[model samples]
Target: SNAIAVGSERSADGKGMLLANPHFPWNGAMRFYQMHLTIPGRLDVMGASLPGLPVVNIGFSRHLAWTHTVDTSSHFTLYRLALDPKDPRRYLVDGRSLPLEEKSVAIEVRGADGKLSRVEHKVYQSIYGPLVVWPGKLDWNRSEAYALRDANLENTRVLQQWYSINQASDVADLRRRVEALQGIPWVNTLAADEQGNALYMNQSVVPYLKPELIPACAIPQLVAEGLPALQGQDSRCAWSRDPAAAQAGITPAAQLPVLLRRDFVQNSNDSAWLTNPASPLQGFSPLVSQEKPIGPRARYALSRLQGKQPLEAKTLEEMVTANHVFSADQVLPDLLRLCRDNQGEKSLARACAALAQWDRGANLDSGSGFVYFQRFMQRFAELDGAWKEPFDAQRPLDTPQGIALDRPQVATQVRQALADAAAEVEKSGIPDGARWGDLQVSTRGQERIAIPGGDGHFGVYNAIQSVRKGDHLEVVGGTSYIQLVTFPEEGPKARGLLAFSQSSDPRSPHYRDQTELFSRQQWQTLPFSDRQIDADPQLQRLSIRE
Candidate 1:
């Protein structure tokens, strides 16, 4: 979910810059490879690419640097068709009778006897897309067929967009690529150039909808700005299409949230309501954006950004590397304060003590983190349900606080949750005063790695989550490819952190080269120039001919 950043907010020399922090899974054909395209004097760019792709998904080619974070817009729509009473498979579309197209899928199975057998099933489709049975949720019990229309299914220019981005010389070139090609699929791009230009855009296709004339079957609460609209019945509320456009029903380039700024630019999988704190961008359709007063992560991000105080590359690097759980800092004091009022209560006192001992950052060595995390989660669950205001969109950052804990029922739940959290830790065989490091661990096919700080819902900027099995916790998600880029007199300075190592092959040393460094929370200096690569004795060459 994490990827890229840039601008004066993170530059030491006041030159624009950012990081590419993608969290791809550890293995598969989708695994990332570091690629350096060399054309001698013509061009030389270095960054990460996938196994079968021809262009870098994210990288810098000396003239520009760019990367992506998944866009927040809703891209698919489900239509509820008005059935033809006479025939179930024939649904009414635009007042016309439409018959579902039937198809069959075949699969081969290896049975217990080591013999291959064929299995087949029937499926149906309409002009809209495919008819999927979302069993138990939206199955045939509800409708003859529930059709899903995907926005990216037929758009295939995404690869060319990355190639264009790699070849861009300035912000205009990037903007033109977005406006003319619309090649990006589902991500928002953050870019900075050698000229110190920086911009962020939620550049992709989204449902072109009429927010004013919402359909009857539209989903609850704007459905991410004009989504969940009434589907299938009479085939009304059709998307406005343009044959010459990058994708059907896509909004004009002028309408999307595309902002250029010298201060800074960022995204945390939230809408583009507040890409820059001081300058808010709005007035776009609900289909592309939501209100800014509502992005908690964005608010947290702006809080840390702190008005871009003459930042250098190292300062920005520190900001990312020292990713603190400010959310814990915000809520914990009050949580402990409430506990202190009941100083005589054993569970409350112990929780207060453990929380007070915790620094609240996701440091690899921090023990208090585990204790506070466990108790806080239990307490928050109780608190969330009781919120009188309950996550008001107008007050996202301020809220998720103000629980009525003084009430008898609320107070009891809070106390018990904290107590049970403590008991849970003790039950795990750890001592009464144990550290978080004792209980938290990460892994890869049983090859365990001691790590820290990757939980997304915890509200940490550098998100990571783990799964528990028996006594130990195995960390997963939130660690991916991270890149730090800036333009200096020396051409460019950069750092790349591939969360999992570069190789998926178990026998290859690269299988864990970057993984181990990531475990240590260390950043590798990205060698973009020939001098840096050739001087390192560890550098190896590979050539194949067949």
Candidate 2:
């Protein structure tokens, strides 16, 4: 999921604009459902919701529009326990052995005979939270165990937060409701208001673990594994409690990173540190987001936004559908040079010719896109890490620039990886010079439509994840519900597209209609006003008396 909002100062028309592009699953229970909810005089919002959610998860009211992207915060922590050798069900805390709490759980199971039977099990718990085990990873034996505590376990404000956000009169009101409720479980919020304010908030439920205290309290072994595990014996290892927080041991809204800017604020699943490159947010807990080198997709997105100064609705749409590949832009020259050197080999020769003519895009007719995609997938780390100039935190945007082809080992590894990638592509039975659209396609019953976009792993802004189905790459998920909204003085003008359409049933006309539109990178008008709804040419009304 990815989202961005630009304020009045940065917009071409001097009005706030937002682009909500949630890359959710195209199939299954998690598919998004488009909705328009109204309460006559009080509320009216339109956006997408999941299967069972009552409120519009990503939507816009008359005064505000907002979207969410999966955040990178650490919401849970594990506590390494020291158990008593005498009794496995007892753990030592503060030098005292305490018995683990056990809860009995029951459920009904249906047999093949169609009869239901009752089943029961025991669940153990420690002071930290629940006792969890994962074979060799997190095994619970006679002397050692682990307990997990999630910050959102005690949160119950999901519905209330969205509800209040929908009723907000402006950006300030929306910000107030989000902070006060603190109901967001996960995902960073990016919003824009009719008042020309753009806001970015990572107010999701996060553990209030102190960064300075983690090194002393955290288990070294777990730290190396990228897992937050603190010693169970020390009471000071527990998450800090804030008096301002709605729940104990959770980060307060005031403490979490938030920015209200007149220019722009955006997040493509990156931390809040550089929501806007000009003003970097700092001095936050590592649990919220570690200050590290951002990912390729994030770097590409931020760079794009920064380069494109004053944005408009049409340009925002262009940005979302731009099939430019970031990784290709970074390493194509080196890759082409390597390919030319190995022109003696048959596969290398073919790859060299194809890549030389390639446009470095994942567009419909991009013939050599699959070749680059395969090569990048097979040698991602080698390509990304072969930078001549190492990353500099001071110059985050431009430091990690060129490839270190001067190093013999680096050049050899890249060349060999490309050769292996070519061999793998040949082994997969894919044709030479196959176009991206021909390989990556969407299936709708008996119909097949060519799809554009590459995987986010390759740093393609318009991401599409696919699986090899026979000879074609069948898209299963990627850019799902996308909306480009702008607040014009006359009214809110918006364009939306559901990649997989609104219905799962094959009989409905809408099931494949928008999917086709998505394939063509087209957007449909999102009717909000009464006149607009009534004026829709395909509008139909049905009334029933009971």
Off-target runs (Cα >4 Å) in candidate 1 are 2-10, 41-43, 142-144, 210-217, 221-229, 292-296, 368-371, 382-409, 429-434, 444-446
| Steric clash pairs (candidate 2) | none
Candidate 2 to truth, TM: 0.95
- How many Å off is the CA of 466 in candidate 2? 1.5
- Which digits, one per residue and each the tens of the lDDT, describe model 1 over residues 425-477? 55555564655555556555557666656465566666666678667666656
Root-mean-square deviation (CA) per prediction: 2.9, 2.1
Give residue 439's lDDT in candidate 2 (0 to 100).
81
lDDT of 2 at 97: 89
Each candidate: what lDDT?
0.69, 0.83
Question: TM-score of each candidate?
Answer: 0.90, 0.95
What overall lDDT, based on C-alpha atoms, would model 1 receive against the true structure? 0.69
